[PDB]
Amino acid sequence: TEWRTRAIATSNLRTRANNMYVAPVDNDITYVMPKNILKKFITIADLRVQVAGFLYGCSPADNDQVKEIRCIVMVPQIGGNRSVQLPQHLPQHEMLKGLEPLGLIHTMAGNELPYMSPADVTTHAKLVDAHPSWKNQNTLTVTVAFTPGSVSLSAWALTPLGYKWGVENKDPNVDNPQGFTTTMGERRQLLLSDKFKGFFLVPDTGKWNYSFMGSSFSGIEKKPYHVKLDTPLPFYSEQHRPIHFTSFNELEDIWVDRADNFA
Amino acid sequence: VGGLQPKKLVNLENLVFDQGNHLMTNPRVRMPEGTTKRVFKGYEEIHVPPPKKRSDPTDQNIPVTELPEWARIPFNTTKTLNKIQSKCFPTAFLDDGNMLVCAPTGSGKTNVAMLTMLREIGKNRNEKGEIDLDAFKIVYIAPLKALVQEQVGNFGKRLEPYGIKVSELTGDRQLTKQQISETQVIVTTPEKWDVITRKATDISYTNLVRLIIIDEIHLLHDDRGPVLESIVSRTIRRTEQTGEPVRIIGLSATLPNYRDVASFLRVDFEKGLFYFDGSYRPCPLRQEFIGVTDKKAIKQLKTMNDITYQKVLEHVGQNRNQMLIFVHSRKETAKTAKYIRDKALEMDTINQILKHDAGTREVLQEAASSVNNTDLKDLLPYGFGIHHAGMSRADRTDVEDLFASGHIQVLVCTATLAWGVNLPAHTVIIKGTQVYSPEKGSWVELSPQDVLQMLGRAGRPQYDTYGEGIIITTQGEIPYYLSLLNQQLPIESQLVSKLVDSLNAEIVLGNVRNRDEGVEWLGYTYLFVRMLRSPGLYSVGAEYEDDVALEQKRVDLIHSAAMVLKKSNLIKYDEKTGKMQATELGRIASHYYISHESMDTYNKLIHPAMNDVELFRVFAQSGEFKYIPVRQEEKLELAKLLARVPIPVKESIEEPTAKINVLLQAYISRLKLEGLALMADMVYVTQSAGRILRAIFEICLKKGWASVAKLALNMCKMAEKRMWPTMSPLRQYPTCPAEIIKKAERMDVPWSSYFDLDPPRMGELLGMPKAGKTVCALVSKFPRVEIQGNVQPMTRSMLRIELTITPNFQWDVELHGVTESFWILVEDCDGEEILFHDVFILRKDLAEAEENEHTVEFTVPISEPMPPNYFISVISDRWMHSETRMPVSFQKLILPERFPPHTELLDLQPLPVSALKAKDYAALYPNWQQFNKIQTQTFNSLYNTDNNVLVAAPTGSGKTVCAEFALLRHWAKKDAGRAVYIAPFQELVDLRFQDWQKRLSHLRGGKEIVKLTGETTTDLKLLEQGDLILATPLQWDVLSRQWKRRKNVQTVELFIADDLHMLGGQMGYIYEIVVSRMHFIRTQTELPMRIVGLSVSLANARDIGEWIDAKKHDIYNFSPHVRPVPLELHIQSYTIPHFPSLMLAMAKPTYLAITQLSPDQPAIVFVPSRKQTRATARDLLTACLADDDEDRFLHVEVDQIRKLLDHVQEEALAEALSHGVGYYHEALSQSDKRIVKHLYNNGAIQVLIASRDVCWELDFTAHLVVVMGTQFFEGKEHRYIDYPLSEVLQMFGKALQPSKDGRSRGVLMLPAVKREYYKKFLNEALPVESHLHNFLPDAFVTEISTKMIESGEDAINWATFTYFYRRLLANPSYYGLQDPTHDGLSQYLSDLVETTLKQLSDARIIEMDEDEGTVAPLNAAMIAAYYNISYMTMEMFLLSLSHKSKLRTILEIVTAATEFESIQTRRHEEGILKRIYDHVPVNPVWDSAHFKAFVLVQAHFSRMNLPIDLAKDQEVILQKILSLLSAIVDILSSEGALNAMEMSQMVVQAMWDRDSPLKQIPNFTPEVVKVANKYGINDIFDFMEQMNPEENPNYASLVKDLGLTQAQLAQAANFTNNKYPDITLEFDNIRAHIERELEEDEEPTVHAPFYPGNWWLVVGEESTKTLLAIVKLEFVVPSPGKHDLKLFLMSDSYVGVDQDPS
């Protein structure tokens, strides 16, 4: 009852991607993202639950203060209403060579907070802390908020105090964790381009949505997973919910006679 | 009768026959005399007494011995035929006319059809050569599968002695056409045969059908009728239009309008049509028609039950007989039987008590009830029975036998038993006449064909004289069945229903291109004849009384039908012109049998961004399910069902759409369905999904939508194999238990972890010790493809890619058949669009072979802002979860440098000829004042500066005069230095030679322009003999190899290189080599030398110009559209996966294209194969025959040309030229060629059809040049390689004859996915890269010999002067260079040279690599250098030889040569080939040229008569002698040896090993040598002594009379005294010349009528295993012992006469 209406709702996500909205910023480093992988990303997501993907890219030769998001890696994840359960291993592949980790991208069911949320601050921080390769070249968290018929993009970098609090947020997971502040994340200028195409990276098995496979997620989250260059599968794809397609045991024969004639 | 314009538009829906199958067009129901009617409470009864015909008036049966001995076999069981077959016999066996027999069911009608087959066997049988199994096909069409299977059974067993194999057309196996080509007397259903012919994939075999039998042809009345009409119509359509005889036989039931059906089959009434009334029925039939009068439903059903009950008492109690009752439902057969038993228990022990008498009721009923597994056998022991398709084979067979035994008194069964086996249970009852049809989605009345077959199965023929058929329906339906069981129900046509789709199918096959063609096609239907005899009944309109042949009516019909086809975008239709042309959408609709409305919704709803749920939605919106309603009686069941299906359908709620969607899902997921109407509708959706999904599949495919197409394909596999894509693939294995499948689907394991493993390690992987052994076999047989792709940036705009597909599984005919189909998909980075796709077949032969590496070449577009990667996927077409995907990264790819704009053509003065400063040179072209514009822009550097110049203009631009302006200037100066011109092929060198030789014989300066032949002995000084020479890149390679020590090789100031772009064409590397050195030549001598190069418009001329060293000022590259005569190009994309079927398909369009663009102008048609020239010419003439103007392309009466009757050596060309066509191919004789060129240019013939292999040799030109096909079959790799761009340019270069428009026109017919490849490089210049790096060793092995490659580092320098080096920097990735920088480039050269030279190290050629791995040319490489033998062949020449030469093995060694592998290999010439092996002595690959060369040489040995195409025999002869003369030079070393010199002796004179030498003399047939043997004429010496005047006892009286030859015997005597030479060469210690002459005053190479186109080698001595020793010889020798023996003689090629005197 819950998921079925959500699956049919995914169909109108493509109309959402066509009309996007990027939040401007009055500040005093620029990031560019190829529309192709972003539109495909929005279409792949769910209407109610968060979907995430690691960011990789590099700075062009002409401009070293600009970094292009060359790839979006899909990892085995269990979506949440306000959070996302990510693994503690990075994707290794030949396609990522010459590229650098640039945070992660995820969508938001409810409307966006004009500040870096405690969830994004905690996940981004602990991802920066746990992974050595993650902290050096500055990374950011990109949120793709959903508004009926539109999409709002925001880019938040992690502040020093935000990092110290995020990792140290041992626990309170909530909308107002003890110690949280609206000034733990500063926004970054994000831009969209149709000049170049970015590529994708999904798990070699092909399955990244372990929501309908939560029992199987625990047996891979703390292990190194292979990644292959391919196209990402939809959230409610058949592979993500193979249990739904499992055959019952109702009568397999057919008590109605009719000739096909077409052999 | 031609009338084009229509006057009234009509609505087809308004004319369609509602009540179709149940149509009753008779207002009168004639009834038998004894007909009576009784009335009862609730129902009526009409009894009809049976006719009697025991007294057959004036006829009996014909004896089986009447037939010939070869046709009396299959009638084994019967000692004589039947009178039903007796009257038909004379026409059925002794005439080839169409037939139509109307006889009662079970009267032995099949025997009549067998005569028609046996007669066709007679046309294919002779006293000798009988049992011809590959020259005829027979088609038997049955309405149902149960019939085709039984007819396959008896025909197969009865025709067994004939060795002919019967089969039923079905499934994908024969969808892959294997069984249609291998089996004869093919049996199938109407739909399957129609869809098979619609696809036209097997058109090559469909032309072999001489006979077609239509059983149950009265099915025309049913909705399936239009299928029979669509078949018979098109058949007779061409059968009487083209002339090709096709016989049609009709097997129908006794019904009205049989005369109309007769005229429909074009049958002669007097001898063709026969009618047998019910009196000819096996057993007389008494008919009961019971009509229930109850109004309400429930009361009717109960009434029927009671009536069936009471009838059971009267037909088993009153008169004890078996009782077959038919019902229309599985679950009903049990209820009806149970009701009869249960309700019978009014203590009515009767029949129950009466059947109990024997010990049977105590046993068999009890004994049989326990053995079987079928439940509901609670009523079996009561003498009741049940028979439906749901029954197991064991149970149904038991019931059938028990009933035949008589142990079953009452058998209730469905229609399955009515069409399956034969029971005739005496009395038959049909309880109710209502059935549910999911199609119409309602409760329609029973089908008449079902009724006839039911009641037709009446009383026992031999046991009963009484046939009692009882039919229980409703009172309102009585008159219908009375009209059916009494020959009253007329057979009408339902064509109006499927008229639109039938016309669509006819337009797709090309059988209908015009509206008049549609009217013509409609004239051969059954609807047409019924409209003729019954204008009012079919409502013609009465407006067509003045319409003679109902043409205007047919025009209005075809118009409206084409209109709806036009508005649906199925066909492209012009209203007023009348012409039509089917589109790609219409093709799919025809190939899968789908309505136009359904196709319309698909084309308007399917978009690239669709998912799974939406695709299911579009599926449910099909027009085939628009009648299926959602009844409230089942809504509660669907709701709970809709909320548990895999794919959410919640978008639709309680609509017919949601029902159809949930049904298809339910069937796949196996859900619960209880409603009878529900289960019926689900089955209908299931049996339609298979074709619906594939239709959407090809729609997504042709629109290039990757994601959607892949989803559609998975759905196809879903419905076909019945499973979800995530289910266990083991379901696709019939021989697989359900237990392991059930266990597998509960395993959290991917399908990827099943492969490459042993049974043990898999047993615990799936948790079953038992399946460990079997599962490993199943997975191993699963189609697994491992691919490896290599990319080559052909252009900065387009990408060329080479795909290598290698099978990774084991074959099983049960699961794979003979061929496995695949799909090659290439997606972009997004994977949203398809950049390329094409079907990939995989035959069992190539797959099983040790070397199974399959390769396929194709191209794909590229955006300069190149995306990260592409996607190449190879997917199975029928197997699910059998995909092989490969990411094609581009981060390594480096695009070639951009191309500068072509040298724009400036508009200056025309520059008249007088500007040359001479009037004598004006004789060049006297007719026209100013010459071609191209040279008016290049002349100022052409005949001025003596530096290099390169011109690049399109073919036929007025191109060759460029070099002329280079020679005219060069030969107008003092001390005219010698010159040399080089064309790519011999065809071109002697073509422009024949022009410049005779047209330019003027010696004023230039004189004696000679043509290089090849032999170095004559050309070495013929170059010094003449002022200029024309040669090929090959003979200019062997010659001038050493440049330092030659006389005239330096003085060449002017060197011409025509068609330099062909350097990239195969064997063009030899062109690149010679051109590369020549530039290096003029550098060392410091002398000034010009090298002009002529070629087509090139993409980049910067590298070629620098290759010749010419600055930008004098380098001209024009756009490929500055051609003087504008080329109007027309491309036609064709979508057919069969090469042959594609050629016949293009036959029509080519005939049209010629008549559209060149009605008064000449036209040429290029064809892939030499053989295809004869066929295409034949298909073209037949096309003219169909339009009724066969001599369309003949513009003069045959009498003016008939003088060239037998002057044409080839018969096919004579018949073709007889109607105004004619062709041209390489196997054509020069004589025939002269006749063609004369008859073409003189305007006798209008169209020519040349081969592709003759594109260069062809001196012809025309207004329209069509390119039929762009692929040729290469037997080397067993593929269909695409045309080289160079060819298409040359072939269109023949279209230089402009029209009144002033613009030439050409058409290019190619496969669909090859369009944007040819259309691109035809709009822009031609790009070409060298292929030297592939064939380096060939270039090296020759270069090593010329003392220029002793260092190998000079090879580094040598490469620099090659076009290969210049391009490697500009386009690195193309060749394999991964590092653009210099150090990386030199690194690549170092690796390659040390790799290829290493290849020459592994094979017998110098090796050492110390103080430089430097190498001097070895013996093998040396001889290979002068004769240009491939090292691949020479590596084959060194390995095979053994301790003993063994002779005849060397001939195998000769045929193992690689030079023969490049031979044309037409597929179906294997039969005759193997036959020649049966007529010749002596593990060869059959399809290989190796075996073909071996056999053809065998033929040359016996001088066997070979077919025209086997001129390949001549090809092998031409080059082998020079190659074999090297084979002996190679075998000079080691021991023996020189047997090949005897072998060369064999081939030169066409002789055997050591047969009579008289075979060499003119004539002298093998019988004449017998006449020579009986007399003293053994060898020729005694022949000449037995021929001369005074001797041979003066003809031994007369010997010349004993010899067959009389006159012209001097030609034989001439060879003996004059041609056959005489010896003149004459024969010094224990240890430490003269001249040929005879007679006198003699000037005479060799007598060679057998062969198309030396004095050195001698040998000596022998001991034990023998050795060798090849103005005397200096033969200095160190030896142990002493000896003296023989020396040999010359004779490089002469039969016998080989002295070995010591």
Side-chain angles (χ1 to χ4, degrees), chain A residues 4 14 238 241 254 258 261, chain B residues 189 609 614 645 687 726:
Chain A
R4 314 192 118 263
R14 33 181 166 266
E238 181 174 350
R241 52 183 178 93
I254 47 184
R258 190 184 185 279
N261 287 325
Chain B
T189 70
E614 292 173 273
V645 297
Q687 299 183 350
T726 54

Side-chain angles (χ1 to χ4, degrees), chain B residues 964-1134:
Chain B
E964 293 185 352
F965 294 166
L967 279 67
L968 176 153
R969 172 64 167 88
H970 180 264
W971 282 1
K973 184 185 303 178
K974 300 183 182 62
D975 199 329
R978 189 182 63 93
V980 51
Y981 162 84
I982 295 183
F985 309 94
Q986 257 287 350
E987 310 171 9
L988 300 180
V989 303
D990 53 32
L991 189 64
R992 289 183 172 90
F993 178 84
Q994 189 65 13
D995 179 34
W996 279 356
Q997 175 65 304
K998 301 307 176 182
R999 183 182 184 272
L1000 185 62
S1001 64
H1002 288 5
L1003 77 320
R1004 266 296 122 113
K1007 42 181 171 297
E1008 184 185 324
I1009 44 186
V1010 292
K1011 150 194 170 185
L1012 172 46
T1013 173
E1015 55 170 337
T1016 60
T1017 299
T1018 61
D1019 56 33
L1020 188 157
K1021 294 184 178 180
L1022 74 75
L1023 49 76
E1024 179 184 69
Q1025 188 194 9
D1027 206 340
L1028 176 155
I1029 70 175
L1030 308 186
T1032 70
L1034 183 60
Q1035 52 205 22
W1036 188 259
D1037 176 87
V1038 276
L1039 175 156
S1040 174
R1041 57 184 182 97
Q1042 65 283 319
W1043 51 75
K1044 61 180 62 178
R1045 54 181 188 90
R1046 277 310 162 190
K1047 309 301 176 59
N1048 293 87
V1049 298
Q1050 305 81 354
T1051 184
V1052 49
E1053 296 181 353
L1054 181 58
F1055 170 67
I1056 311 82
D1058 195 341
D1059 301 327
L1060 181 59
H1061 62 71
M1062 294 299 302
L1063 67 82
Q1066 245 43 271
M1067 230 92 318
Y1069 63 87
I1070 213 68
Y1071 201 147
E1072 188 221 20
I1073 295 179
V1074 293
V1075 176
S1076 60
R1077 295 209 304 256
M1078 290 263 291
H1079 166 64
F1080 166 60
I1081 305 305
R1082 58 179 178 179
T1083 60
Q1084 306 304 290
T1085 56
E1086 193 257 355
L1087 63 81
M1089 174 187 299
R1090 154 181 280 188
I1091 298 183
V1092 56
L1094 176 59
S1095 66
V1096 302
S1097 51
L1098 307 174
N1100 178 271
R1102 243 177 61 260
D1103 296 326
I1104 307 184
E1106 301 168 3
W1107 195 30
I1108 308 298
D1109 189 30
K1111 274 55 184 178
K1112 308 177 182 180
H1113 177 278
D1114 38 332
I1115 292 300
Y1116 315 93
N1117 194 332
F1118 302 79
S1119 64
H1121 301 303
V1122 295
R1123 178 170 169 265
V1125 185
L1127 177 63
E1128 189 182 44
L1129 191 66
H1130 301 262
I1131 79 93
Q1132 296 185 1
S1133 61
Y1134 290 71

Side-chain angles (χ1 to χ4, degrees), chain B residues 1218-1423:
Chain B
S1218 175
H1219 296 335
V1221 182
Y1223 49 93
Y1224 195 110
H1225 59 98
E1226 62 285 4
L1228 217 60
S1229 66
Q1230 291 71 358
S1231 62
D1232 285 331
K1233 298 178 179 177
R1234 304 186 193 285
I1235 297 183
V1236 179
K1237 54 86 172 183
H1238 166 72
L1239 221 49
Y1240 180 88
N1241 295 268
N1242 229 87
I1245 59 184
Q1246 185 179 16
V1247 173
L1248 181 65
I1249 304 179
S1251 173
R1252 89 169 187 90
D1253 303 86
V1254 200
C1255 56
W1256 304 106
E1257 165 184 334
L1258 210 61
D1259 190 33
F1260 293 77
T1261 61
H1263 178 208
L1264 169 56
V1265 171
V1266 302
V1267 177
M1268 179 179 298
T1270 67
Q1271 291 183 325
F1272 68 95
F1273 179 76
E1274 178 60 38
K1276 196 181 307 175
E1277 303 178 4
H1278 299 80
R1279 324 180 314 172
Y1280 273 100
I1281 310 177
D1282 295 320
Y1283 275 4
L1285 292 173
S1286 312
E1287 290 194 27
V1288 180
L1289 295 152
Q1290 179 73 188
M1291 303 200 308
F1292 281 154
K1294 265 48 185 175
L1296 294 174
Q1297 301 189 26
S1299 176
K1300 171 186 162 301
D1301 274 22
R1303 47 188 51 181
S1304 180
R1305 318 186 193 281
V1307 175
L1308 181 60
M1309 295 183 178
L1310 43 64
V1313 297
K1314 297 296 182 178
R1315 160 185 152 88
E1316 288 201 359
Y1317 169 79
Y1318 285 90
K1319 183 176 182 177
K1320 179 177 181 178
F1321 292 101
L1322 263 60
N1323 289 18
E1324 55 179 293
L1326 164 63
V1328 290
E1329 266 76 354
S1330 178
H1331 52 279
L1332 206 300
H1333 54 290
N1334 288 15
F1335 299 153
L1336 256 184
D1338 256 19
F1340 284 154
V1341 71
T1342 70
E1343 281 293 358
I1344 298 296
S1345 62
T1346 321
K1347 75 263 295 182
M1348 306 311 175
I1349 319 300
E1350 75 294 67
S1351 60
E1353 183 177 6
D1354 192 16
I1356 311 301
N1357 313 122
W1358 170 78
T1360 66
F1361 298 143
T1362 65
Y1363 183 64
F1364 153 79
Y1365 176 85
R1366 284 273 156 71
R1367 281 297 304 176
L1368 189 56
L1369 172 149
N1371 195 335
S1373 281
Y1374 183 95
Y1375 302 90
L1377 184 61
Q1378 283 292 310
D1379 191 87
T1381 55
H1382 307 74
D1383 286 27
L1385 179 59
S1386 299
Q1387 245 293 349
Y1388 178 70
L1389 281 177
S1390 301
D1391 301 334
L1392 181 58
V1393 63
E1394 291 187 349
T1395 299
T1396 54
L1397 294 184
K1398 188 68 176 184
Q1399 297 175 334
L1400 288 176
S1401 184
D1402 296 24
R1404 184 63 154 96
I1405 276 169
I1406 318 80
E1407 55 168 48
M1408 187 163 299
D1409 49 13
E1410 197 272 326
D1411 248 78
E1412 175 171 295
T1414 234
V1415 158
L1418 222 62
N1419 51 18
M1422 284 294 297
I1423 55 87

Side-chain angles (χ1 to χ4, degrees), chain B residues 785-846:
Chain B
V785 169
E786 189 182 35
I787 64 179
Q788 300 183 12
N790 193 33
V791 186
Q792 297 171 305
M794 174 169 50
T795 305
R796 191 173 183 86
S797 303
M798 170 176 295
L799 227 65
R800 168 185 170 88
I801 185 173
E802 171 179 324
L803 192 69
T804 300
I805 298 177
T806 63
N808 206 335
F809 71 105
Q810 180 170 125
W811 201 279
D812 195 337
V813 302
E814 304 276 26
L815 304 176
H816 307 346
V818 174
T819 64
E820 267 290 350
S821 300
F822 285 85
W823 287 101
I824 297 182
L825 268 178
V826 182
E827 310 166 351
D828 49 29
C829 61
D830 297 328
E832 199 67 12
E833 185 186 27
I834 303 181
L835 289 66
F836 180 86
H837 71 84
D838 190 27
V839 55
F840 176 84
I841 33 68
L842 187 60
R843 299 173 61 248
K844 176 176 177 295
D845 309 333
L846 283 297

